[PDB]
Structure 1
Amino acid sequence: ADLEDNMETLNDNLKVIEKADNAAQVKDALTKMAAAAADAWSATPPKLEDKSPDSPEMHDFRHGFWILIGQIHDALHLANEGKVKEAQAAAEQLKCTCNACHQKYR
């Protein structure tokens, strides 16, 4: 799917996690984010259209996705332990990742 469509999915489900009542909303949303993150790996963003697939920017770009996927991984385990509040705090920190890539390649 479109990088944009994958971003929108990340964004929708993120908010869903921040306004979640139960651990199940958090689990469902996180699983969805991990899929989006995954399908977004192979994508090349506008600001790097001219760049080489092997350039540092592109390698750094995809690296942000590995970091994200990793932080969603952890988030899920917490939500799985029923520790909702912290699962939400963990989602907040991966936001530190959303911003970073954005400020650099969006």
Structure 2
Amino acid sequence: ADWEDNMETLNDNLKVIEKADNAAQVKDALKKMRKAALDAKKATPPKLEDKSPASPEMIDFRVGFDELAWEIHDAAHLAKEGKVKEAQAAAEQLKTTVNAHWQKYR
């Protein structure tokens, strides 16, 4: 796919996570987030449409999505342990990371 839809999936599942009631919902939403982040690793953002796929910029873009995958992982750990509130709290910081990323590469 392409970058815009991966950002859309990320924010859709962040909203699911805020709205959720139990650990299972958070876990599934985080799985969709990790899938979307790994997918965005394959896309080229609008702002870097003019830069090479091997340019330093594209490397930092992909590594940023590896960092997002690892943060998602930690939140998924909280959700798998059953700590719904702590997972929701972690997801708020994930939202900070996602909105900043969308801001930069919009």
TM-score (norm 2): 0.92
Which residue does 1:21 correspond to in 2? 21
Q: Aligned residue pairs: how many? A: 106
Which residue does 1:101 correspond to in 2? 101
Which residue does 1:8 correspond to in 2? 8
1:30 aligns with 2:30: yes
Contact 2:30 2:75 in 1 (8 A): yes
Q: Quote the offset at 1:64 in angstroms.
A: 1.4
Percent identity for Structure 1 against Structure 2: 80
* Equivalent-residue separation in structure 1 for 2:64 and 2:100 (angstroms): 8
Higher relative contact order (CA 8 A, sep 6+): 2
TM-score (norm 1): 0.92
Any gaps of 5 or more consecutive residues in structure 2? none
Contact 2:20 2:26 in 1 (8 A): yes
* Equivalent-residue separation in structure 2 for 1:48 and 1:5 (angstroms): 16
Alignment of 1:1-106 (within 5 A): 1-106=1-106
Any gaps of 5 or more consecutive residues in structure 1? none
Q: What CA RMSD, in Å, does the superposition of the two structures yield over aligned residues?
A: 1.2
